[PDB]
RNA sequence: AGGACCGAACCGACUAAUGUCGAAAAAUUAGCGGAUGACUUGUGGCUGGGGGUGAAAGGCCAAUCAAACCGGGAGAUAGCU
RNA sequence: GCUCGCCGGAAGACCAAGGGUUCCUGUCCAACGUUAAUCGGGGCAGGGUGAGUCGACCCCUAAGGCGAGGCCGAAAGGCG
RNA sequence: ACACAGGUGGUCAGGUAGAGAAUACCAAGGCGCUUGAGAGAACUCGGGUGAAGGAACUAGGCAAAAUGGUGCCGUAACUUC
RNA sequence: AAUUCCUUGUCGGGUAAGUUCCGACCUGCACGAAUGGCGUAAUGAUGGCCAGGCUGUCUCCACCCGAGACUCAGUGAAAU
RNA sequence: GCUCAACGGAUAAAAGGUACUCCGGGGAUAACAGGCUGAUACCGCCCAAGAGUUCAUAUCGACGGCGGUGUUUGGCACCUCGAUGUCGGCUCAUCACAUCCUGGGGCUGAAGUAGGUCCCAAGGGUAUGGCUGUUCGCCAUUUAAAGUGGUACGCGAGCUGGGUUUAGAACGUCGUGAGACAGUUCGGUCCCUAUCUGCCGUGGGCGCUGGAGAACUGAGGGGGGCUGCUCCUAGUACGAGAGGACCGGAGUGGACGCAUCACUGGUGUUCGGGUUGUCAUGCCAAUGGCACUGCCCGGUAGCUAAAUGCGGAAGAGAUAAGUGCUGAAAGCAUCUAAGCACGAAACUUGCCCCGAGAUGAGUUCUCCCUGACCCUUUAAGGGUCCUGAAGGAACGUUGAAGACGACGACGUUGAUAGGCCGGGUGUGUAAGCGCAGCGAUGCGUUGAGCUAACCGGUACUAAUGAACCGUGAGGCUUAACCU
């Protein structure tokens, strides 16, 4: 459960530590986001060798969440921290060469094949 | 009665 | 909406609930017979039953559990001695509810709540 | 209807009758005072000085 | 809360209509004694169902 | 030693709620500021109405104050309802 | 009478000020107590308040009042 | 104005734990505060808890929530030292 | 600026976004040196802003415990 | 002898402030609003120079004019000063279309997408944060859209009081001064227990006529009607290339509403356990009371969503805009004058709910009542004895039904409630005993003990036999039918 105003830190190695997700991206009056869904954010602290800076507003992917995901047998995965990794907002492409922690089984749909494909975990 | 109060503080309106 | 809860709230919280549901209790088991209320009766209905129930079987523990309740030496004296060998062939049930009339000083349904005794 | 203090009226009725120019993006604000149509005149007169200025600035840049 | 004008005395029985007490009209006879009392009551004596249920 | 610090009695009411034909014509609840001094309080006196008093609000002067209450001019006056 | 619960630097016990018998006993409840009322700080009757050692009375005094004569002021009176 | 959640000066004043007249429970002593019995609807008050965010709510961190005690280490800008 | 109308005058910082705030620019309608000016350690139930923790304030409310509200017995108003 | 110039001259002789104010009043007279009009404002139309490679009319349009609305400011004071609470914000909305999106079409200066303009269509939806008290405006990011207005610029007997106008104090300006400033800024008590209409629900009496138990049909009314993204068609048509379809189908999303605890959670002060301070059971152990449920840790059943499904439709009839066929008036032409076939989330259905108080009171099935008499204003009359029928009502056990009524199950020919047995779940190795250790404490019996609201059984207790209401077959007229 990610909605507006939520610290998140982040899972590649892009530069950013610390994310505030503005608004929940997809469809109009949404609450908060899912499984694998695009949010907005801006920059709150990064590193200084990091190719983004502090305060910049961009696209980004949750990829573990406090609140669970639910997989369809009934069972539920309930992450210690919220994690998001970062996209170039018209083509999604992240930035960060390495990520930390393992994501989730339905990130996998066409558009986020290099985040699970440099994921050390499931 | 013995007493009768000052009445309520009204709308100002002014 | 309290679907398909029990217990009787009684106006009270349960630290007097529960406290005078002890003394009630102690006095239906040292009086044989009292009168109060109609819902004070149904409620002490399970009150009193498990009591006779943890009085069933004499052992060393159970006059601990049943000191535990009702806080009194002689109420656990008259348990296990006199009530136990009498209520040994009866399996629950052992308390009875009778009305009778109305209170004169706040309208309330009486009930005389006993148990199946007074044979002596 | 305006900014401001004091007046029953000066909730209710509008005095805000800002001068926005479409060629220049100029807006002028007199959010003055007791009604609109004098604010709509001070907020004219602003136009024309403030169009007057602007040019004989640039003339004199020019 | 404060009324416009005061109702009537039709008003009032109208109102009045449904305060009318319901008598139960049921009273029993006891199989033993034959004393009056109602339905799942003791008698004044302690009659229940023929049997002293009071002893007193 | 401190017109020192925290914090009870005590003094006062800064916030919010309960009341607001209230438990009471200023209150209570949960937090407050001072609490060895420009502090608080008991008892008994003194200052009084164009005056008294005021670390000063034109406040208070017996629940009433930019001129208290009581009695008398007075059944004042009122082009007003 | 049996237990449960409250205060206990008080919600305990003595007084001062202030009330004026509200103290106790017997009897009764029409009026009062925001409900019954055989209960009472409620009605009726009776009893109870014992000081050389407690406090008041008495000596003196602060703040302050009155104040012989005395000063001032139409009078009333003011100061002392 | 009431058998009123207000105010009223002085004296005695214990046990355990506690720095303490604070606070928690008790002794000596008086009380259960002159409407009760049911049911546990919406709504109102005093509260308790809560997945995930942590002020995005609001004029305003208002209210709530959070820190809180003893011993020891260490404590910045500035300064009237 | 407790001052300032134009005005949210202009630059930078803080926030992604700041008519509030801070440091300045002086174009001071209409600051100003005892109806005192500029700074100033400490202090303030003082005005404003930001940062961390903290949370039902909110997202978005949900349940539970007592006091009312509902019913019965007794006494029983008020504004109008 | 008076510019007693306020000049039919109140004194020979007189300026100001009140937000500290106070009284008698007024809608004779203002502010907020309602009323009349529409100068102003918004929108629509007539003429036409001209802009547009030509070309007024794809889109604009000067100079001019005519109209609609009461949404802005205005004008008059018609109603209110023996009281109509106003701005903005939160919640709750309603209505019109001069339509923001979705839908159906026409023109185009429309190759396709993306467009410009216009018509019909109100069924649905119609932002989130910073600033400012602000409506508004700007910024940032979404969306298919961030619609305009009315309803006392909706809504304070629904809520604040940030701003504005009670009393305090200040800055700058004016005034000799008191004081004033629609020039800010600091801070400042917002009452009411619902008599009537209305609305949300829920009941009693009576009616429909002989009564009752049910089952429905159904008038009529109500709820909902939003759509993004991806893929196939299809990189297809179109297009030099880049780009990129219409229509149709499928899947996955956001919001809304409904349903339920099957999963995950929250609560679960009635269940279990740990622990602190004190007290009690004569003391150890053990347990209980208080201190916010003492502090907590979990957690049964119910409630609840953040949890899980469902739906917006498909189809039919009649249509608006629009496209048409045949076709004269008017030998041609012509969607219309006669007629016919298409054509939208708009209308009625179709999806769901209430509903015969629909006094027009409906239909079907079933049950039950077939006993004598007097008085007589022989009236659809009144009275007495005997019987109480089907059924209903009262009481009790009670409920995932419920404020109270009402509804459902049961009442001994019983599983309705309480108790008991077993299981399940939850807390988690109870007490006692034995062993090791100076001790706290640790281990075995023991994964025990205790279990609320759960499940399956068990009459152990409580729902007693009875009494109450409701009746003797049921009005007049006409027709068809068996006698």
Redesign the pocket.
Known sequence: ???????LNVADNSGARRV?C??V???????YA?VGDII?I???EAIPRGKVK??D?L?AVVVRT???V?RPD???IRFDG?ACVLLN?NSEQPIGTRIFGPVTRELRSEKFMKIISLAPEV | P??I?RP??????? | ???????????????H???MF??MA?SLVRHEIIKT????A?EL??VV??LI??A?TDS??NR??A??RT???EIVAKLFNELGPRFAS????????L?CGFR??????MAYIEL?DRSE | ??????????????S?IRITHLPTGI???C???????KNKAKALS?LGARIHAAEMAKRQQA | ???????TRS?RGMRRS?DA?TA????????TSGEK????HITADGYY?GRKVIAK
């Open positions: 459960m990610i909605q507006e105003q939520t610290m505030m503005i608004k991206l997809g469809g109009s009056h949404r609450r899912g907005k801006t920059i709150k502090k305060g507003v696209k406090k609140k669970g639910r009934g069972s539920v919220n907002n | 013995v007493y109060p309520r503080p009204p709308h100002p309106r002014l | 909406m309290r679907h398909r809860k029990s217990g009787r709230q009684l106006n009270r919280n349960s630290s609930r529960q406290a002890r003394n102690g209320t109609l819902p004070k149904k209905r399970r039953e498990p129930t943890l069933k060393v523990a601990r559990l000191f535990a806080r009194d030496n009866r399996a629950g049930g052992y308390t009875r509810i009305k004169a000083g706040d309208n309330a349904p199946v | 209807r305006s900014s401001g203090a004091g007046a029953q009226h000066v909730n209710t009725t509008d805000a807006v002028v604000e959010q003055d005072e007791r009604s609109q149509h602003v | 809360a404060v009324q416009q004008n005061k109702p008003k449904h007490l139960v009209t049921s009273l029993s006879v006891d199989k009392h109602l339905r799942h169902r």
